[PDB]
Amino acid sequence: MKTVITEVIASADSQGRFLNNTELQAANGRFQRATASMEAARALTSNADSLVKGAVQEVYNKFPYLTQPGQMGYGDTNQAKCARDISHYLRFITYSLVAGGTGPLDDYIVAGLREVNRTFNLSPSWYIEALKHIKGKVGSQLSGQPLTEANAYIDYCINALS
């Protein structure tokens, strides 16, 4: 699972080599950065409930037709599975924040994304718009390096979906 720590260890191992000053300098970055990351994580964690309901709705407001009958934003089960899915994304964003890398996002959401979305007729556009909205609101929950971190990972998901 990709973190700064696992990456430097992987690179050492693959050259049959003890960790050296290059690799320990790298690790210090990840540790120095934890404070901002983890502040973003705590803010995204406690606002999760509303961030999810905000983004879910915004998917319907931007794609009005989704909420008409015969469509995929209609009925309790679609709308339920949607909230859940955005919640999955925010969850892995917090994990990536806490972990010090994109690993959790890469392993649990990115690997396989398109195949799944294509089989199930899920448009990435919705998910990008959910995330664009989450990005708008996270502008006033955080600032400075915690915001930059939150942004880094939200944007990472949006690029994964384009």
Partner: protein, 172 residues
């Protein structure tokens, strides 16, 4: 591969949950002690050769049968293999120590190792001992280094020991 954070994340996910305030602060503490951790990993890297050498000298001091004909650290080829394994294990112990998790050690080094040695006729009890000696000297270095700020590294010395002890247990 896991580190101490990644481990937290996997357990959280299996609940379907954002990390508990419990788990958050456990990880905040790991960040708190991370400079000490870097010194501890650095202590091993900076003395790797001597740690292996000194463990070695002492292993064969105790077990003079290994360096007789018939013995598993004879002739030069076998001694070089034994010296190499000492390095490999010390290496994965240092990786675990940077990571705050034993998994890289268990998955890339310890998994299958005992059965390899038995297939080879390599005396596992002697290998376990060589690991115990590396532990003594490695920790020696973690505890008494060049102009590091004075403080308490016993938590980290314990954790390093458990990695040495995992390896020993797994192999004997």
């Amino acid at each position: 591969m896991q580190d101490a954070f990644t481990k937290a994340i996997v357990a959280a996910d299996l609940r379907g949950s954002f990390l508990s305030e419990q788990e958050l602060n456990q990880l905040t503490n790991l960040v708190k002690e991370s400079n000490k951790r870097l010194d501890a990993v650095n202590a091993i890297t900076g003395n790797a050769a001597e740690i292996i050498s000194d463990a070695a000298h002492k292993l064969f001091a105790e077990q003079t049968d290994l360096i007789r004909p018939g013995g598993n650290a004879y002739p030069n080829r076998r001694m070089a293999a034994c010296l190499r394994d000492m390095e490999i294990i010390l290496r994965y112990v240092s990786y675990a120590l940077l990571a705050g998790d034993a998994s890289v050690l268990e998955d890339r080094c310890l998994n299958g190792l005992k059965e390899t040695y038995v297939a080879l006729g390599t005396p596992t009890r002697s290998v376990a001992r060589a690991v115990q000696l590396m532990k003594e000297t490695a920790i020696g270095y973690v505890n008494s280094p060049s102009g590091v700020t004075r403080g308490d590294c016993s938590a980290l010395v314990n954790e390093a020991a458990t990695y040495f002890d995992k390896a020993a247990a797994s192999i004997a």
